[PDB]
Amino acid sequence: RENNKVEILHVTKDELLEDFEFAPETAQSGLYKHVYSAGYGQFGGEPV
Amino acid sequence: SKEGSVAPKERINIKYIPATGDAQAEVELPLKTLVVGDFKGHAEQTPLEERATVTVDKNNFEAVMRESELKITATVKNKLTDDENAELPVELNFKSLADFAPDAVASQVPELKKLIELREALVAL
Amino acid sequence: SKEGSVAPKERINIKYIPATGDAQAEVELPLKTLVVGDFKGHAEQTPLEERATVTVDKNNFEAVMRESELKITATVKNKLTDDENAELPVELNFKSLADFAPDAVASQVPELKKLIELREALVAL
Amino acid sequence: SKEGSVAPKERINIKYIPATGDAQAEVELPLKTLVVGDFKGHAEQTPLEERATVTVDKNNFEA
Amino acid sequence: MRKGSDNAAFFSANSIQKPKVFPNTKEGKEAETNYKLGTQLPYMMIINRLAHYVKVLQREQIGAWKERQDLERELNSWIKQYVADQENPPADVRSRRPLRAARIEVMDVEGNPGWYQVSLSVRPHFKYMGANFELSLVGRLDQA
Amino acid sequence: MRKGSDNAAFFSANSIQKPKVFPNTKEGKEAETNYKLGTQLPYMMIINRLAHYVKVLQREQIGAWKERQDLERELNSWIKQYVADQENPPADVRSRRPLRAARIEVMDVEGNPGWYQVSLSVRPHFKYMGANFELSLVGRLDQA
């Protein structure tokens, strides 16, 4: 009720590395999209 | 439209205007946290960028578990006998935190469930 | 045309002209490097002046490897037995850097691949 | 990397930068002494340049 | 699109034209400034309406007794109509009076009496279109 | 863990970052002060929320008629919202208004009209995180 929110994202350490190593740069990582792109960097959105 | 509607111009025009001066209204930002972790017993085939996040709160926590669908396929030492080569494989399923209680564990493991049934039969003496 | 268009002359003529004075516009030059080297397992028949250069960047590095088509035909000591005269010839192929991992090496060498299959069968006990 | 990471350029860019000015950070140097002497009952066959030094402190002296 | 709403927004209205780069000197950077203003539609619209007003209102003046400095005098008094050169005019005033400064010079077309060469240069109020922020924690900061 | 209870406590929340050492001079010690504030999460959280508020609220202002000093004026009035610069504000006030002082400077991005370069520096209230005590018995002490 105090404007607190929480989201769950299922990820193992191994596949975090998979994604970070797979992507060419951090700006194209899947996690970056969930954290930055779809939040902080989106007009009308909200920041994690 | 947030502009505010007025009538066509006449000799006498009356409009209500809120005296907020030049104050810039602002929006309160929530504190949102992201919990990242291995909440299932296996990795997903879906790419990280594709799998979605789940909003959790007090009024739906259990619902979230139910929808997430938890399952554990694992093997433990079978101590219901006296053989070191005896192993027991179980397939546990969880819908809520109550399902991690020994009561539920027994109900989902026939090798124990039947022994509980036996217990009750013996108690019924 | 970069001249800028105007209407036919009248009594009153109006034209927009950007006040850049006599300043000479200039073009920024990139820093381009040329990496020259033996990126394949063999020399090409095509003359140096004929073979072309390949532009590489972060968003297509792997694509470039795939298109370049890498192959290694080589012979190593066969240590899967106890014979000094035993030799093993392999034909490795690469599409991306991931293909240089032991995992890929095994998959492209039947003499090892089958042993990995065996390993998995033994694990399945 | 000690450079510090930033996001791709947008209309509004925000970066935290520590105000250390032009002050040059420096590293404290230890006081290390070298004790050289005949700690064994015999000379070693190993050349001086080859035999190595041993770091000693209160928590491993006996070791 | 504003996320989660029914509102959208145009953050800028750049034209097709690509900005030119000039040498990094006082003069060169001024050239860049000038050219970029030209490349953006929010400023070009000002020029466009000015062009339209000049065309119309000047045709009405054709045949009047005007000497070179007569045009300078009158054109100056005219352009002031749309200028807001105050220390800090409110956004509403800045909107209806888009210009901050203006300069007019009039010359004669030599060998053609009654014809003139006019130069009109204007400095519009600037739109806020981006910024970089540097954040820093500090001890012993002067107290605001 | 608080011995003999069911209570535990986090005495500090230092980040991973190791503090840098500077020369022992007025300026060097100020550099150390500044850098250490950066290394501790209780202060970084302040910066983080400020960053978030700036990003959001500034996007709303894009396209407004702002000159350089307009941003200085407005940004100053904004940051004051979270400042508690009293002689001795109570801990509750200090909590909801984490900053003691703040400084803002705005410059122009030369050759790019409508773009600005902003510097924001803040001095947070300090947390009590340790102390050394020297005890001494004394005769003829001035009487408190």
Brief rundown of the structure:
Chains E, F: Residues 30-141 form the TssC1 C-terminal domain. Chains E, F: This is Type VI secretion system contractile sheath large subunit. Helices cover 44% and strands 15% of the residues of chain A.
Supply the number of helical segments of chain A: 2
Radius of gyration of chain A: 13 Å
Q: Give the helices and strands of chain A as they follow along the chain.
A: EHH
Oligomer: part of a larger assembly
Query: How many helices of chain B in DSSP terms?
Result: 3
Distance between the termini of chain A: 18 Å
Order of helices and strands of chain B: EEHEEHH
- What's the shape of chain A? flat
Write down how many β-strands of chain B occur, each being a DSSP E stretch of 2 or more residues.
4
User: What distance separates the N and C termini of chain B?
Assistant: 78 Å
Structural class of chain B: alpha+beta
Overall geometry of chain B: elongated
Protein structure class of chain A? alpha+beta
Count of beta strands of chain A: 1
Largest interface: E-F, 35 and 43 residues
- Helicity of chain A, as a percent range: 40-55%
User: How are the strands of the biggest sheet of chain B laid out side by side?
Assistant: 3-4
Largest sheet report of chain B: 2 strands, antiparallel
The main β sheet of chain A shows up as: none
Q: Strand portion of chain A, in percent?
A: 5-15%
PDB class: contractile protein
Keywords: t6ss, phage, contractile protein
Entry title: Atomic model of the VipA/VipB, the type six secretion system contractile sheath of Vibrio cholerae from cryo-EM
Chains A, E, F: VipB
